[PDB]
Design a protein around this nucleic acid. Structure first.
Ligand SMILES: [Mg+2]
Ligand SMILES: [Mg+2]
Ligand SMILES: [Mg+2]
Ligand SMILES: [Mg+2]
Ligand SMILES: [Mg+2]
Ligand SMILES: [Mg+2]
Ligand SMILES: [Mg+2]
Ligand SMILES: [Mg+2]
Ligand SMILES: [Zn+2]
Lengths: 98, 206, 134, 60, 155
RNA sequence: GCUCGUGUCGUGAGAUGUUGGGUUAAGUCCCGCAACGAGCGCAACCCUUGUUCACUGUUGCCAGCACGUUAUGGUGGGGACUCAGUGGAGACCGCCGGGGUCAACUCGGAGGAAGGUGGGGAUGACGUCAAGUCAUCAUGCCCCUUAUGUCCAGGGCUUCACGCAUGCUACAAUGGCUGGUACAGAGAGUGGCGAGCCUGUGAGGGUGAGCGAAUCUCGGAAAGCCGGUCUCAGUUCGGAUUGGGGUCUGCAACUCGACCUCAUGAAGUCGGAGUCGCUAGUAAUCGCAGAUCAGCAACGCUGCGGUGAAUACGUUCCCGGGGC
């Protein structure tokens, strides 16, 4: 019941946000499933290092998306208001499935 | 010619990204507006001296941290210049901009402002050796553990290009735990432009 | 010197990107890997020896049943993972009578040999494009 | 790139198939990534400077 | 290499015949990385061997290998302005390797249709004392004897 | 490896440090020493892989428990196993023995998933080549300004007596064809990935769920194994070329797209002098995925796993480099 999907690029801020969510809902009772980590999206970009005629030397980059999942077993409309009104860091987004 | 950018090398390890937002269907357009914001701010606020522009987004609302040595230019008189630059920012982007301007505690220790000053002196036609020595001495008076400055180009208005450099202390570029601040600027002279690069070893971090 | 102990047990095995969940139990010595029998899942004697020989080098012999759940990798990698899993199961069942010989045979060890990654400017992990001077 | 080419690429094409990408910072028409616009050089330099969130060097 | 003698990978034994020789034979056939194909060929050849003679196929393979094993072979030497063919004694491992390589190559060169019993025919002929492999062993020994005068250049 | 501060030597450029002995992958350390120090490089810190623990348990997993349409962990449920991903542990010549004047190191052994840097990546010192890029961007000066700006249609960048280079497919039987049947990893997806059903020889078309995705789709892995068949034939090898009939994308496939199908069936019998890659999960081969991208000339590139070798006596010779 009540899904919370957290996505960001830094696992430190992911973990901090998940801890804040779970400690908030708990402060409002509502027992909630622990933050379960989904597989991290791993996009890879290869780029010719030089601006011209040098293809054998290249640079690789990744955009790792870290995802965590929270279940709010207890309905608790007070926790509903809390989870819609609290503030989260800009780097992480929130997805609430009612 | 073959050296990596220190900031990119230490990105994620010790230093952090200048932009903090998440978006997976608009990523390109947010990148474009960020580029527009940064170009506009750099082109219209040279006088203040920009260490960094840090961009955050929550929901169609953008937040700009402007790390400047002298925010007097940015704030103008009683925030008039701050209001006008914010208004130009809404005009440029179309979103709600919350702009805040922060000091740099040690401008003589921040590499980007050091490159700013060295390039300004070179443009004002100060002897490059004297400028580099002054910047180096000021950095070590502040208390940096290592300075390295390199000016490349038609130094002194000459014809051939040189790559004159100064350094003392320790600047371990190869060490990832080493906190190395990197700055770069271009002195626009009557003879092309001079590239000034500055590495400053702040210390060691975990 | 003692003929070890029969005793149930379980372990896990891994080799070349292949995972082997092994559960060894007293029995007749028959096999069932992913439901199908040994002669079905490892259809040929090419690499049945590599999975049977843990018992041969242990005191117990083909009078001791095993159930295997195998995932990932190819046939040989799965064989190696299953062998390591059985070796570890025998280890943690009887760590005194089968441990010395079982480790000496180089079987309580997981070889980290994994496919080396491809590298930019090279056709494969180490193969290089044909150099052509002038 | 040429300014006329940049504005022509920006404007809606006559036929849908005639559109193309262009580096949104640079104007470069080759090697433009759909994920974040930009181009080869623009991606490399901006990722090094740290304006692209989530993008870091990969050394797996 | 400069640093020193690189370690040798241990040779495994054939599960069926219980001899490292057959494993070395399959690893020498072993074209394209197809171990199963190579040892299907090898097992078929050995079974054909035991079919045509009652003796053990591993024993007949061993006898063929001893009949193809070279004792000494000549190598090029850059002494002076002309090249020499210095005869050098061959260690047991090197000579087993040479015998296996020659067996496999001449089996591949034989005129019969299929590789399996091309190799079977070559093995039987070598064990008897005939064939291209034995001929090459005799020729290399003959040329070593011809150039035997340079046994003092060994280092 | 390249240097510096101070000292010292020399009229001076300069030298010493940085030579010597030993060692190391390493200017890595050790010993002695007119040197005493420091800095950039080496190493380590980072990423990934190999062992293990704690925490969490869905979209992942199913050992014990209860049904499921027969059936599908489908179900309640479970923290065991696997895995996912956060935080820890683990390797340090740390222990034992020998060598090593000792000392650095070195050899052997035990423990251990791993032993002497465990494998791989990121990382490229002072500088060299007036090396490449004014065409990614930026810019000094010079030049164009009813044109060297700029818009458009058509053409060209795809030409072809030739030469070189990098690849692909081959020349077959360790193979071709055909039926059946196993085992992956890493990735991508809403103008997208598209299942299922119907239709067509097929490319495809028509309907069309599901999935912003550990859920749904791409999906089939191929090599391999097993049965049948071909029987050494320029072939049931090879698939170039050429003729016919099509499909799809696109405003539009003539120049100049991919694909399907029918027919055609070229050179090629293992390649001269010469030359290239590779020391292990490597070479060899086998398929898969992605970027760009309406489509695609992609056999390219960057990755991914499957199968999986032979050999290294040695430094004499060839090429490149290091100390004196
Ligand atoms: Mg070249
Ligand atoms: Mg296009
Ligand atoms: Mg290093
Ligand atoms: Mg030039
Ligand atoms: Mg110009
Ligand atoms: Mg062309
Ligand atoms: Mg996605
Ligand atoms: Mg090597
Ligand atoms: Zn660009």
């Amino acid at each position: 019941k009540i899904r919370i999907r957290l996505r960001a690029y830094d696992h430190e801020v992911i973990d901090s946000s998940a801890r804040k969510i779970v400690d908030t809902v708990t402060r409002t009772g509502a027992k909630v499933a622990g933050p379960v980590p989904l597989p991290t999206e791993k996009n890879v970009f290869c780029v010719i290092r030089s601006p011209h005629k040098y293809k054998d030397s290249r640079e690789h980059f990744e955009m790792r998306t870290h995802k965590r999942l929270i279940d709010i077993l207890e309905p608790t409309p007070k926790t509903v208001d809390s989870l819609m009104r609290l503030d989260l860091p800009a780097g992480v987004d929130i997805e609430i499935k009612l | 010619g073959q050296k990596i950018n220190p900031h990119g090398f230490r990105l994620g390890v010790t230093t952090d990204h200048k932009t903090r937002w998440y978006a997976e269907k608009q990523y390109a357009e947010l990148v474009g507006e960020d580029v527009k914001i940064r170009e506009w701010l750099h082109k219209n606020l040279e006088r203040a001296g920009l260490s960094s522009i840090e961009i955050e987004r929550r929901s169609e609302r953008v937040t700009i941290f402007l790390y400047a040595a002298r925010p007097g230019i940015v704030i103008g008189r009683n925030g008039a210049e701050a209001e006008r630059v914010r208004g130009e920012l809404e005009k440029l982007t179309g979103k709600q901009i919350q702009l805040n301007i922060l000091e740099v505690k040690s401008p003589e220790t921040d590499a980007q402002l050091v490159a700013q000053g060295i390039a300004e002196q070179l443009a004002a036609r100060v002897a490059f050796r004297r400028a580099m020595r002054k910047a180096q001495q000021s950095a070590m008076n502040a208390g940096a553990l290592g300075i390295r400055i390199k000016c490349s180009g038609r130094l002194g208005g000459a014809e051939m290009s040189r790559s004159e450099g100064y350094r003392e202390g320790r600047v371990p570029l190869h060490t990832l735990r080493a906190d190395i601040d990197y700055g770069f600027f271009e002195a626009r002279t009557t003879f092309g432009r001079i590239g000034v690069k500055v590495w400053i070893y702040k210390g060691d971090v975990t | 010197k003692r003929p070890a102990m029969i005793a149930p047990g379980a372990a896990t095995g891994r080799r070349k990107e292949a995972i082997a969940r092994v559960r060894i139990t007293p029995g007749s010595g028959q096999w069932k890997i992913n439901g199908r029998t040994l002669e079905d899942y490892f259809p040929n004697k090419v690499h049945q020896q590599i999975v049977t020989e843990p018992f041969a080098t242990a005191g117990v012999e083909g009078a001791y049943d095993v159930i295997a759940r195998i995932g990932g990798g190819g046939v040989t990698g799965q064989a190696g993972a299953l062998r390591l899993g059985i070796a570890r199961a025998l280890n943690n069942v009887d760590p005194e009578a089968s441990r010395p010989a079982l480790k000496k045979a180089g079987m309580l060890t997981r070889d980290a040999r994994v496919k080396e990654r491809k590298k930019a400017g090279l056709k494969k992990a180490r193969k290089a494009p044909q150099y052509s001077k002038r | 790139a040429k300014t006329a080419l940049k504005v022509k690429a920006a404007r809606k094409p006559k036929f849908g198939v005639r559109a193309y990408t262009r580096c949104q910072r640079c104007g470069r028409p080759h090697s433009v990534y759909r994920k974040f616009g930009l181009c080869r050089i623009c991606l490399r330099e901006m990722a090094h400077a740290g304006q692209l969130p989530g993008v870091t060097k990969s050394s797996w | 290499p400069r640093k020193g003698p690189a370690p040798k990978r241990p040779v495994m034994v054939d599960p069926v015949y219980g001899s490292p020789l057959v494993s070395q034979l399959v690893s020498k056939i072993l074209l394209d990385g197809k171990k199963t194909v190579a040892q299907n060929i090898v097992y078929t050849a050995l079974e054909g061997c035991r079919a045509k003679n009652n003796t053990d196929p591993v024993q007949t393979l061993k006898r063929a290998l001893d009949n193809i094993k070279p004792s000494l072979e000549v190598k090029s030497r850059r002494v002076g302005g002309a090249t020499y063919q210095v005869p050098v004694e061959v260690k047991p491992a090197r000579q087993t390797t040479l015998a296996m390589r020659w067996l496999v190559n001449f089996s591949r060169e034989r005129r019969e249709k299929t590789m399996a019993e091309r190799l079977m025919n070559e093995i039987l002929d070598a064990s008897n004392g005939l064939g291209a492999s034995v001929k090459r062993r005799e020729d290399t020994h003959k040329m070593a004897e011809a150039n035997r005068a340079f046994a003092h250049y060994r280092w």
